[PDB]
A paper describes a structure:
GcoA belongs to the CYP255A family of cytochrome P450 enzymes. Our recent characterization of a two-component P450 enzyme system consisting of a reductase, GcoB, and a P450 oxidase, GcoA, demonstrated that it demethylates diverse aromatic compounds, including guaiacol (which can be derived from coniferyl alcohol and represents the aromatic functionality of G-lignin that must undergo demethylation), guaethol, anisole (methoxybenzene), 2-methylanisole, and 3-methoxycatechol (3MC) with similar or greater efficiency than other O-aryl-demethylases described in the literature. However, GcoAB shows poor reactivity toward syringol, which can be derived from sinapyl alcohol via high-temperature reactions and represents the aromatic functionality of S-lignin that must undergo O-demethylation for further catabolism via ring-opening dioxygenases. In the present study, we hypothesized that substitution of GcoA-F169, which has the closest interaction with the bound substrate, may relax the specificity of the enzyme sufficiently to permit the O-demethylation of S-lignin type substrates.
The closest contact is with GcoA-F169, which forms a hydrophobic interaction with the C6 carbon on the aromatic ring of guaiacol. A broader survey of variants at the GcoA-F169 position (amino acids S, H, V, I, and L in addition to A) confirmed that GcoA-F169A exhibits the best catalytic performance in terms of both specific activity and reaction coupling, although other small side chains (S and V) also permitted reactivity with syringol, suggesting that these may permit syringol to assume a reactive conformation at the heme. Each protein variant also crystallized successfully with guaiacol and the structures showed that the orientation of the bound ligand remained consistent with that of the WT enzyme. Furthermore, comparison of the surrounding active site architecture confirmed no significant deviation from the WT.
Author numbering: 6 to 406
The structure:
């Protein structure tokens, strides 16, 4: 596309460091645009992302780097009967009525455990010391990975993150950094070494862990789903389900620190925490551009005539800064009117864990503000955000008296 010649000079590193300037141009110039370094069309506005995610002429497709990492059948990349089975498999523990039965006794003692390690120090780095551990310990226990240390769960989602966002392609459309997939392969090998013995045991002795239920639920007597059939969805969980609640917590905190009067409001009135989190997810979406859809017939989107079989990356983190929807979207504002947002996606492949994720984040922040009401940002240490596919702060240094 001639007027988008400048996109030829956009780099993967630029998008990872801060994608918002490029995507501000894309939203104005070309809401659906082919980005050469990504080797794909990209949807940048709320209207186009929603249309693609919900269209009857599109279905799920995994990104190239996602496919190289997760294989088949990753719940995010399949459709039809297989997708319906995988959704039936994961949905029971995520049902709102079910989550409300046990989410408090799950998350609150975990939040207290990690808080007790530092709440009297007067300083902490909240990403590593609190947000990520609460996120991975809660979900890890739900899955049946109680014996997998939070440090290890966090290392796995970091490696899987970098692997499935290893999207850069060269002039010929081949991956520019094929060696970047090796650490994804290494994480999967380690995951297998840990989880294979657990699956062995769950096949013979089912329990209330989620992975045990993935093996057994809905199956004929004495049968389980083959481990190869569920492993890619295990990997999906060990990346985003482990990573995103902690990132959403942390981005919410960074935004509140950027509006000190709003931080004070929420500490004083913790019933405002759900609204603070919803704005945090819009303001810096944890899953920023990690999923995609593929057209199943010729379709015209945003004035582009796409052939059948065209992938489109859904850059939801950009759509959540759509100035057709939001005033001054790069500013965190607790008091923004509650509007629809796309941080959980849309359509048949929208996030299955929204209700759970929202409560994990709410409980973590409630406990944090109860334990340390006088939290302040360490204004010497600046907050760097990183990531194009998944985005969040790399650290969050705070102090308190
Ligand atoms: C704040 C935290 C989270 C955010 C922002 C988030 C966001 C998203 C997004 C954007 C997608 C892709 C939707 C699309 O392509 O349209 C997704 C998919 C998914 N998420 Fe969440 N997620 C979060 C936490 C979780 C958790 C904790 C779980 C599990 C307990 C989970 C389970 C899933 C599943 C299973 C899918 C695949 C859905 C499908 O393809 O059918 N998510 N999520
Ligand atoms: C819930 O985990 C994911 C969601 C979207 C893309 C990759 C993931 O691991």
């Amino acid at each position: 596309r001639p007027d988008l010649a400048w996109l030829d000079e956009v780099t993967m590193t630029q998008l990872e460091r801060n994608p918002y300037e490029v995507y501000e141009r894309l939203r104005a110039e070309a809401p659906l645009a082919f980005v050469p370094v990504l080797g794909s069309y990209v949807a940048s506005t709320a209207e186009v992302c929603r249309e693609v995610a919900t269209s009857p002429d599109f279905e799920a497709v995994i990104t190239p780097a996602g496919g190289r990492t997760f294989g088949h059948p990753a719940i995010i990349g399949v459709n039809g009967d297989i997708h319906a089975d995988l959704r039936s498999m994961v949905e029971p523990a995520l049902q709102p009525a079910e989550v409300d039965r046990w989410i408090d006794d799950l998350v609150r003692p975990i939040a207290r455990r990690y808080l007790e390690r530092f709440e009297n120090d007067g300083h902490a780095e909240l990403v590593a010391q609190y947000c990520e551990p609460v996120s991975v310990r809660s979900l890890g226990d739900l899955l049946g990975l109680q014996e997998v240390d939070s440090d290890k769960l966090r290392e796995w989602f970091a490696k899987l993150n970098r692997s499935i966002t290893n999207a850069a392609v060269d002039e010929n459309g081949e991956f520019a950094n094929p060696e970047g997939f090796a650490e994804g392969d290494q994480a999967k090998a380690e995951i297998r070494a840990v989880v294979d013995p657990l699956i062995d045991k769950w096949i013979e002795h089912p329990d209330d862990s989620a992975i045990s239920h993935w093996l057994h639920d809905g199956m004929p007597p004495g049968q389980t789903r083959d481990r190869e059939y569920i492993y890619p969805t295990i990997y999906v969980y060990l990346l985003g389900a482990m990573q995103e609640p902690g990132h959403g917590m942390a981005s919410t905190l960074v935004g509140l620190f950027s509006r000190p009067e709003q931080l004070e409001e929420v500490v004083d009135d913790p019933t405002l925490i759900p609204r603070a989190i919803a704005e945090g997810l819009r303001w810096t979406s944890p899953i920023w551009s990690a999923t995609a859809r593929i057209s199943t017939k010729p379709v015209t989107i945003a004035g582009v005539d796409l052939p059948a079989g065209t992938p489109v990356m859904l850059s939801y983190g950009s759509a959540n800064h759509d100035t057709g929807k939001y005033e001054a979207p790069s500013q965190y504002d607790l008091h923004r009117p509650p509007l629809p947002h796309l941080a959980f996606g849309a359509g048949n492949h929208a996030c299955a864990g929204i209700y759970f994720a929202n409560h994990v984040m709410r409980i973590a922040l409630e406990e944090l503000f109860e334990a340390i009401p006088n939290l302040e940002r360490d204004t010497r240490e600046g907050v760097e955000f990183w990531g194009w596919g998944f985005r969040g702060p790399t650290s969050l240094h705070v102090t308190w008296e």
